[PDB]
């Protein structure tokens, strides 16, 4: 690392650890940034992205569009938004994969689990 010699800074090792991470670690890696308004109401800076949140697309060809998150794909490292779509060569409709770090989430969907986390973070 920087000063403690007990963990690595090898490209090989922790580039192998990113692509074979277990499914319980993949949700911490898949985290987004909180808006300015949500950063006063909550003392956290960033949260892992969940399903029924609302996000603003900030980077890419679809920058500036908003909408709701309809699916999370932990194997491919991607999320899906409700009206951002594509046509295949057949003519069937699909969803364009978005990377969660390209996004900032503007409205949350709280529950029993979330509260006991935001409370600790504040």
- Name the segment binding RNA (CB under 7 A); options: 30-38, 39-47, 67-75, 102-110: 67-75
H or E segment and range at residue 77: none
Q: Applying CB under 7 A, does 51 fall inside the site for RNA?
A: yes
Check if the beta carbon of residue 39 is closer than 8 Å to that of residue 56: no
Q: What distance lies between CA 95 and its chain's CA centroid?
A: 16
Selected from 3, 36, 40, 113, the binder of RNA by CB under 7 A is 113
- 40 or 89: whose CB is closer to RNA? 89
Q: Applying CB under 7 A, does 50 fall inside the site for RNA?
A: yes
Selected from 39, 41, 83, 86, the binder of RNA by CB under 7 A is 86
Q: Applying CB under 7 A, does 57 fall inside the site for RNA?
A: no
Rounded distance between C-alpha atoms, residue 80 and residue 78, angstroms: 7
Rounded distance between C-alpha atoms, residue 81 and residue 36, angstroms: 21
Check if the beta carbon of residue 17 is closer than 8 Å to that of residue 44: no
Rounded distance between C-alpha atoms, residue 8 and residue 44, angstroms: 28
Q: Applying CB under 7 A, does 20 fall inside the site for RNA?
A: yes
> What residues make contact with RNA under the rule CB under 7 A?
5-13, 15-16, 19-20, 22-25, 27, 50-51, 71-76, 80, 86, 88-91, 94-97, 112-113, 117
């Amino acid at each position: 690392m920087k000063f403690n010699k007990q963990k690595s800074s090898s490209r090989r090792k922790m580039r192998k650890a990113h692509f074979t991470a277990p499914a319980g670690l993949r949700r911490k890696i898949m985290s987004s940034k909180l808006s300015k308004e949500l950063r006063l109401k909550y003392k956290t800076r960033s949260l892992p992205v969940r399903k029924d949140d609302e996000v603003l697309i900030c980077r890419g060809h679809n920058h500036g569009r908003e909408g709701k998150v309809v699916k999370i794909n932990r194997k491919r490292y991607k999320i899906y938004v409700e009206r951002v779509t594509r046509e295949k060569v057949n003519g069937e409709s699909t969803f364009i994969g978005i990377h969660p770090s390209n996004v900032v989430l503007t409205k949350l969907k709280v529950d029993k689990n979330r509260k006991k986390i935001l409370d600790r973070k504040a």
